[PDB]
Amino acid sequence: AMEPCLHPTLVDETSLVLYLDLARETGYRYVDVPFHWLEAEAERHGDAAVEAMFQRRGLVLANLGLPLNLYDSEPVFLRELSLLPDRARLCARLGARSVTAFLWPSMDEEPVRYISQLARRIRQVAVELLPLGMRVGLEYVGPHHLRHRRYPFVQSLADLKTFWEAIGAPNVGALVDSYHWYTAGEHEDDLAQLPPEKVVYVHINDTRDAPEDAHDGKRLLPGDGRIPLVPFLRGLYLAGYRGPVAAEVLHETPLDGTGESRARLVRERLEKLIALAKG
Amino acid sequence: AMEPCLHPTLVDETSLVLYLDLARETGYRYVDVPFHWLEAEAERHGDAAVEAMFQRRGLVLANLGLPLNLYDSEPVFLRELSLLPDRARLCARLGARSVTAFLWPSMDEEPVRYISQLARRIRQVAVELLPLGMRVGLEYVGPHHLRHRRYPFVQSLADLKTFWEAIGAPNVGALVDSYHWYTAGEHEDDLAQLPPEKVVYVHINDTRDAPEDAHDGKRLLPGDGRIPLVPFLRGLYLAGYRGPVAAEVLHETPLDGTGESRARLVRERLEKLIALAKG
Amino acid sequence: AMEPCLHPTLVDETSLVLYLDLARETGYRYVDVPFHWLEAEAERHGDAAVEAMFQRRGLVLANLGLPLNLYDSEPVFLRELSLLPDRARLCARLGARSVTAFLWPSMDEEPVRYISQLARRIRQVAVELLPLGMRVGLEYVGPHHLRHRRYPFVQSLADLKTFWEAIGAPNVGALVDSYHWYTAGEHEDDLAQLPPEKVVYVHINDTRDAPEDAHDGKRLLPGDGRIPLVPFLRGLYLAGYRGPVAAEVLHETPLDGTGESRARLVRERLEKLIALAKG
Amino acid sequence: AMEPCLHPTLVDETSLVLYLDLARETGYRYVDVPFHWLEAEAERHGDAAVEAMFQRRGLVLANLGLPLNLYDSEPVFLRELSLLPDRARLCARLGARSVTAFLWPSMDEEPVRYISQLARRIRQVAVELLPLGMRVGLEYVGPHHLRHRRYPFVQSLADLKTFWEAIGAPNVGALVDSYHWYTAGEHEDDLAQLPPEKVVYVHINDTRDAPEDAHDGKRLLPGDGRIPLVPFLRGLYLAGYRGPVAAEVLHETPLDGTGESRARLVRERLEKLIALAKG
Secondary structure, eight states: OOEEEEOGGGTTOOOHHHHHHHHHHTTOSEEOOOHHHHHHHHHHHHHHHHHHHHHHTTOEEOOEEOOSOTTSOHHHHHHHHHTHHHHHHHHHHTTOOEEEEEOOSEESSOHHHHHHHHHHHHHHHHHHHGGGTOEEEEEOOOOGGGOOSSEEOOOSHHHHHHHHHHHOOTTEEEEEEHHHHHHTTOOHHHHHTSOGGGEEEEEEOBOSSOTTTOOTTSOBOTTSSSSOHHHHHHHHHHHTOOSEEEEOOOOSSOOSSOHHHHHHHHHHHHHHHHHHHHO | OOEEEEOGGGTTOOOHHHHHHHHHHTTOSEEOOOHHHHHHHHHHHHHHHHHHHHHHTTOEEOOEEOOSOTTSOHHHHHHHHHTHHHHHHHHHHTTOOEEEEEOOSEESSOHHHHHHHHHHHHHHHHHHHGGGTOEEEEEOOOOGGGOOSSEEOOOSHHHHHHHHHHHOOTTEEEEEEHHHHHHTTOOHHHHHTSOGGGEEEEEEOBOSSOTTTOOTTSOBOTTSSSSOHHHHHHHHHHHTOOSEEEEOOOOSSOOSSOHHHHHHHHHHHHHHHHHHHHO | OOEEEEOGGGOSOOSHHHHHHHHHHHTOSEEOOOHHHHHHHHHHTOHHHHHHHHHHTTOEEOOEEOOSOTTSOHHHHHHHHHHHHHHHHHHHHTTOOEEEEEOOSEESSOHHHHHHHHHHHHHHHHHHHGGGTOEEEEEOOOOGGGGOSSEEOOOSHHHHHHHHHHHOOTTEEEEEEHHHHHHTTOOHHHHHTSOGGGEEEEEOOBOSSOTTTOOTTBOBOTTSSSSOHHHHHHHHHHHTOOSEEEOOOOBSSOOSSOHHHHHHHHHHHHHHHHHHHTO | OOEEEEOGGGOSOOSHHHHHHHHHHHTOSEEOOOHHHHHHHHHHTOHHHHHHHHHHTTOEEOOEEOOSOTTSOHHHHHHHHHHHHHHHHHHHHTTOOEEEEEOOSEESSOHHHHHHHHHHHHHHHHHHHGGGTOEEEEEOOOOGGGGOSSEEOOOSHHHHHHHHHHHOOTTEEEEEEHHHHHHTTOOHHHHHTSOGGGEEEEEOOBOSSOTTTOOTTBOBOTTSSSSOHHHHHHHHHHHTOOSEEEOOOOBSSOOSSOHHHHHHHHHHHHHHHHHHHTO
């Protein structure tokens, strides 16, 4: 089934132990946890202890945020790429099937250099992941205030699909965030026509701003705004997506309420959104 | 977690509806269902109805038995290969992450022909599956009575690992069956030293026959025989396998009891085996 | 080692037989011929005859100008791609080891859409040429007047090198033109430090214009201008390039003297420049 | 089109300079040279000098005998593999477009272990040669006395063709030997129906023995035996092969006449056979 997934931005919580406790307590099964959190624990207590935290609580790791920097110098990049398989296997064991990263909507660097190197490194990343049966989902970023550097890059799903050709790796798709689908002015049918395997991971959230205005860093809880979230989910559902939907609510200032009431409220809100979209 | 998975041979049951009912009723979540069963339903009632049968019962499809014949004529093979992606996507939606097939331990055909064509077609199969994040697990077959054709093929995990090189596809591993691990005279450490992603799917079962004697077609319920099943599981567990373990108990004659008592008894037996192996 | 190659730009001759007669009579071995003249003579006479023509005259085809349009619609590009292997085979028989294309130094199309699709299409051309032991030499274009479309593309070897990363094909190299090397303000060692198989084909020509002034369609014969041509061929030589070096002198207005004079004179100043290069 | 190539088996000459002098003096363009003689002369004199030697004499290296052992230990095979690209580059400069190896028609090693590893290793050799526009010509061996090891391997073109499927590399073809074509009881059209790029290199020789009798180390000069050689070259010709045709006459006992006589005589009977072939 499509299911609600807890995300760190929803709750005011930095302790790994307590974050996982909050997920269980508020009735989630899927948790999004950044890899540095898991790595900090693996180092202190070994990989098996980390798996025990998830399995003692009935939790499944939703995803692995790519743990390298696609813009490093070549020697650092290659080094971090060598380390990716073991980091990916640890996350597979905790339930993740996907590794994700976002793409900048604009940049100051010369296109042929920036785009070509980035195509090749993403390909290398995707290739290290083929033995593990994992896909790369690339988040296209839609808000307009990120477009004012010198040259355009990816600003939409249509853009992202042409960028797949540069990469040329069979296991590369999309992380689809409502915020970016909204800000890019896309339609339910843009998402419905994706092959299922190309919907790698999904974010949900909201805004009362018009597409041109909405700020990437100033988001609302799913359902406190104007984004058509039932058509968003429905489209993903008709695509054939059947996994976690995380409420990534990036914000600059304290969100309203407590970590706990927020977690429970959005779980409830998303189960209802998800059942309306199935319809 | 490693979990028990129901297999069709355990129960005396040919109706899809009732087989799925038996899985729920006997407390399983993972079910092994051959694809022809699911296809027969998809044809009568459309793909969505098939997904509804699993989701209404809390069930997850464990695996997809490769739905083509690796030994057909080229035009039929190519045709069935074209149809594999949509069949694989339907099974992904029901929860399967793996597509499997077994290899003959001996054959009458000339080696260079038989082995080369088979390497190339498995590669083609594995390649169609890279976009879906799915792995191919190849079952090595250990019993000795299948070795008396003209030429040897794969009879063990060590053999299978050399055959991976012929295939040259990054998402190809093993379906590990205790029956074949036993009959091939392998050790817990053979399985522990596998990379996790190479343990694609797992079968469990038993026998009172010595390795040289055991018949492929005349198996016993997990725990009614002499195969060291705790070291079998433990090895798979230390490899890093965290999925379904199916009791494939091929038999020529009625197994002892009812379908229901068998299903419940082996679930119980495997949860206990699995907890001893974790230890 | 390196040898002079007749380019059509040198001669008035627009008939294949007469062109080939002139190459013979002016001393050349290596002839560059536009592909259409060869498709055309293979239509009237047949494959056997075009081969007969060359060999009778001691002649070897230097190259094949990529006979398709890399910017066309997808269905038309695919058709021409499908035709490419037989055309490349006919050119292999005549001695062509290379297939070439130039890149636009600027474009109005959005960078992500343009760069990705063009990388993927060159990749497809390259894959089709792998069974034939043939390489793609991509021509980077340097002149400054060509750089005033909306977005920048390839303008230098350094740029071309990063573009090879997008393409991601083992058999893709450079067509190095003296006009472009000079107008890109490159150095002899930029050439020297290339692996020899990355130097696919070479053009040579001159200008009295500064690097920033020199015009694409208004070139001169080599040894009539300001470009250091001896360092040009010494960098190629030390890189390990060994085939034909063609005098591509594009011009809007007639080069004085006859075709027979320029042609014969070019061979001679080419041989001497190539001794000076070679120590 | 096709042209005669001096093979060492023809001449007493065991010194590279003297061998090359003889090819010149006996009329040849295409010379086959064992690689060690070239590694050896590139040690005393240097890369520049071995190139100088050839070009001064109007000579072109036909081929490179694969300078490694495909059956060695893994670490030793990998080292020699790593050395292969520079050795192949030095041979490219001398005009070699091909790299060749023969296959054993039988072996004692288990088929799965032997075939898989050897397919994967030839695949690795082929991948290293893709950036250089070079192909692998694999020599199938036909004589019947070679077929009495424990398991059968490649004995015919038909077999070799299926072996290419295991290897799965776009640049791998055949070394076609008249001795093997005859002793495999093949037909002219078996050759004709090959794509031209699959004909990598060609050996020619004779025997008075029947197909079933003829011995591998006991061959004759071409035009001294019972093999239809004109249909041999017409099938190659119509396949589209255009390079050197080498007289490999392995022998345990001296061929009568001098080296200078056999060498000169071979060129002549080769040219005439090649006219008869060509219609």
